[PDB]
Design a protein around this ligand. Structure first.
Ligand code: LXX
Length: 837
């Protein structure tokens, strides 16, 4: 042993994976070593040319709505070379390699103005880019040039079951330097032996006056035998006053299958939040509450009656958040071999396991050894995800879920990457099948790797609870992604580190000339001999930002003073001259927004399977650090509030016809207008459903935007989530566009209802998928929204356990609730947010 290298990694990671200042064992270093094999295996087995060109493809059928967009078996592609330019007809079913020969009669077709290649043996209609142009009504322009040298992607060269005694732990005492100014209070230590949120046993100390030092010197003996402890069980240590104030966790079985042994001084965390599960200890040793404990062995590795079958089937059919009674679990377990025949029973069945009994666990492994129907079943992501949530601590169970994820194609790993990374928070151990899966899939595909880096880095920078685990995973990735990516990552971070500083300096300073002048001045200096001459857009990797357009850069008139930034595209082969627009904002935990936007993408894909295209606009958004990150500026967009602020202003005097007026104005040909009107109808219904199902529908119209072409979309998800009546936003102005007012109707309004109904019942067809992603989303991403009531909102919103007919009438009623309310809620939002009442 690389020093200037481990230094670079550290800077890329934002955390030093060699720092053992905050550990009580070697699990992290052990994980560092373990991840060497998965990394090397994958780097050794990846195609250099495929890896360098990263074809973005899918094997899904071309949506019905995209088929119609095609005339005959014909698709035109415009090819560019030096100065020449010739369009070429194509069949949606032929490879790019064939199209190439149809052009002449070693170059590769790269998209103009993007790092995106149409390569490989896939039909041209199956490249995500081609599907994007078709949908948008944009034309496919490619440049013909030489393939990227794979040389650039070079990687730098390098017995428990015999101890029948009851488990015990001695609580020595707790220590905190300065305690709250709240005299006096009383405290006790609660110690829980946990396994997948199942409390196997629980003991508390006696009450003791809450002083800066509290000594008990008491042994807590549990009802559980040491030989019954399950791998992955936690000693959960909590301090209560008299309310929960502090918590810390310690793994009972360690990463080498060894019973935890000895003296511990654990710095605790201060108060279904996933943070509560971490086995990491507080880094702040000088302020944090401390607990002292002492411990004291290696862990080895007839026909159903009809009424019962019905009962079992009714159990298996309930939603993932439906509670199991003791009776349900006993039925499940008793009939485990029959349950094993239904992949959908698996989560509930493995919830029926008494993990605190060695003999039960042994039988459960006997179950898992009889896994043929599971391995033969078609991938069901919703079902798999349920095995990776907070209810399962057994790694054999969680491993069969990851095994199913193995068959995902790149495009689908992208769809689910954010929440897969978040699900690492539910892993008992730092080294897990899931972590290695993410690592492997990131090293296999540059597009996946890019988002993995940023998803990980985002958590490493604002989560003390998990930064250590995540940082170890990011390092393994950075050691195999290759030089070219390393550099691009380095550039991006340098750029963002500079833009971040500028944002803060500006905030410290209506936007007066002084703050405007400072912004432009600061941006001038950076651009002058300070900022890299090109960097990839973290939310749109194929895109490369060039130089700032300081003329268009401005400080937005918001209370957190977001930077509105403009860039030219560095790629000269870029047709248009449109700038690349990035909002740069401090003050919000944009991770929440990220999660809402990711769900939006999942809802669209769901709709796609039903050949439906509600027209959501899930803009790019990346959390880069502590309460900071970037947001994609959508072109040609104004806020619904501003649209109406024109005709009026100060007074909350909303007018009904204004929105429609604005759409007519913004359409050159009267034909474009009717399309915009239709686009409005679909994106409106899409947002009413999506927003209703997520519970974020009641918005002030300043947080709802619209495109010149009629694409409605919600923004500012952080604000509502952070401060969390009408079921969604469908106001007189929206209704007017569809051609209705009061006790009336319209073709477009009939259309609206219909679409909502379709969209909605379609989401219900994936109820389980939606419920598990929603549940996880709250637990790992919105701490302030992790109460029992919070997690369960979506059960009601999806009207779980209802006919499509009952469900349909339910949503229609919701549409009618909006009608009856008119501008009433908007008026209220205005009073509050615009002035303050
Ligand atoms: C000015 C501009 C915009 C805007 C225009 C175009 N595209 C956009 C994309 C995203 C956002 C947006 C979304 N969520 C946000 N949270 N905080 C700022 C923030 C900004 C905003 C935009 C929205 C409101 N006022």
């Amino acid at each position: 042993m690389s020093q200037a290298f481990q230094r670079q990694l550290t800077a890329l990671i934002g955390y030093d994976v060699t720092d053992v200042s905050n550990v009580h064992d070697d699990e992290l270093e052990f994980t560092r070593r373990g991840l060497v094999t998965p990394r090397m295996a994958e780097v050794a087995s990846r195609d250099p040319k495929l890896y360098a060109m990263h074809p973005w493809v899918t094997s899904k059928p071309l949506p019905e709505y995209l088929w119609k967009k095609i005339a005959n078996n014909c698709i035109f592609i415009v090819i560019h070379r030096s100065t020449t330019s010739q369009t070429i007809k194509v069949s949606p079913d032929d490879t790019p390699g064939a199209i190439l020969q149809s052009f002449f009669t070693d170059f590769v077709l790269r998209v103009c103005g993007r790092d995106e290649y149409l390569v490989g043996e896939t039909p041209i209609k199956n490249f995500q880019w081609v599907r994007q142009c078709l949908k948008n009504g944009e034309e496919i322009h490619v440049v013909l040039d030489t393939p990227p040298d794979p040389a650039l992607d070079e990687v730098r060269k390098e017995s428990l079951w015999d101890c029948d005694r009851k488990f015990r732990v001695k609580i020595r005492g707790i220590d905190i330097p300065v305690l709250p100014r709240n005299t006096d209070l009383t405290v006790f230590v609660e110690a829980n032996i946990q396994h997948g949120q199942q409390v196997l046993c629980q003991r508390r100390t006696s009450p003791k006056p809450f002083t800066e030092e509290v000594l008990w010197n008491v042994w807590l003996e549990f009802s559980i035998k040491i030989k019954d402890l399950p791998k992955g069980a936690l000693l959960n240590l909590q301090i209560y006053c008299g309310q929960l104030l502090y918590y810390v966790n310690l793994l009972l079985i360690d990463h080498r299958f060894l019973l935890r042994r000895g003296e511990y001084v654990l710095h605790m965390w201060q108060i279904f939040n996933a943070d509560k599960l971490t086995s990491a200890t507080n880094p702040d040793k000088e302020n944090s509450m401390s607990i002292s404990i002492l411990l004291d062995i290696a862990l080895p590795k007839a026909e159903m009656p009809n009424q019962l079958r019905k009962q079992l089937e009714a159990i298996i059919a309930t939603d993932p958040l439906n509670p199991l009674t003791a009776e349900d679990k006993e039925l499940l377990w008793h009939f485990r071999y029959e349950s094993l025949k239904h992949p959908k029973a698996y989560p509930k069945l493995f919830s029926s396991v008494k993990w605190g009994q060695q003999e039960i666990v042994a039988k459960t492994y006997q179950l898992l050894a009889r896994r043929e129907v599971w391995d033969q079943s078609a991938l069901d992501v919703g079902l798999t995800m349920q095995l990776l949530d907070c209810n399962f601590s057994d790694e054999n169970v969680r491993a069969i879920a990851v095994q199913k994820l193995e068959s995902l194609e790149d495009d689908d790993v992208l769809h689910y990457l954010l929440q897969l990374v978040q699900a690492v928070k539910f892993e008992p151990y730092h080294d897990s099948a899931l972590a290695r899966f993410l690592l492997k899939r990131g090293l296999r595909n540059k597009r996946i790797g890019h988002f993995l880096f940023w998803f990980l880095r985002s958590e490493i920078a604002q989560s003390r609870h998990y930064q250590q685990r995540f940082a170890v995973i990011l390092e393994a990735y950075l050691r195999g992604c290759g030089t070219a990516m390393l550099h691009d990552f380095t550039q991006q971070v340098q750029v963002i580190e500079m833009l971040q500083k500028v944002t803060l300096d500006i905030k410290s300073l209506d936007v007066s000339s002084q703050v405007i002048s400072q912004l432009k001045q600061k941006l001038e200096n950076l651009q002058n001999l300070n900022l890299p001459e090109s960097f990839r857009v973290p939310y749109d990797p194929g895109l490369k930002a060039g130089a700032l357009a300081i003329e268009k850069c401005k400080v937005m008139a918001s209370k957190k003073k977001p930077l509105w930034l403009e860039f030219k595209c560095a790629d000269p082969t870029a047709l248009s001259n449109e700038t690349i627009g990035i909002i740069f904002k401090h003050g919000d935990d944009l991770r929440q927004d990220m999660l809402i936007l990711q769900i939006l993408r999942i809802m669209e894909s769901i709709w796609e399977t039903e050949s439906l295209d509600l027209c959501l606009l899930p803009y790019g958004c990346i959390s880069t650090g502590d309460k900071i990150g970037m947001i994609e500026i959508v072109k040609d967009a104004t806020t619904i509030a501003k649209i109406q602020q024109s005709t009026v202003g100060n007074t909350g005097a909303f007018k009904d016809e204004v929105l429609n007026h604005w759409l007519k104005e913004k359409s050159p040909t009267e034909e474009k207008f009717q399309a915009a009107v239709e686009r409005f109808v679909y994106s409106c219904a899409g947002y009413c459903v999506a927003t209703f199902v997520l519970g974020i529908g009641d918005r002030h119209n300043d947080n709802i935007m619209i495109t010149e072409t009629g694409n409605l979309f919600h923004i500012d998800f952080g604000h509502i989530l952070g401060n969390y009546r009408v079921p969604f936003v469908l106001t007189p102005d929206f209704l007017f566009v569809m051609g209705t007012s009061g006790k009336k109707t319209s073709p477009h309004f009939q259309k609206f209802q219909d679409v909502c109904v379709k969209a909605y019942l379609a989401l219900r067809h994936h109820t389980n998928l939606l419920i598990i992603l929603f549940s996880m989303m709250l637990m790992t991403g919105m701490p302030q929204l992790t109460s029992k009531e919070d997690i369960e909102y979506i059960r009601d919103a999806l009207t779980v356990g209802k006919n499509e007919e009952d469900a349909k009438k339910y949503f229609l009623d919701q549409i009618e609730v909006c009608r009856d309310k008119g501008w009433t809620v908007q008026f209220n939002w205005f009073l509050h947010l615009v002035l303050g009442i």
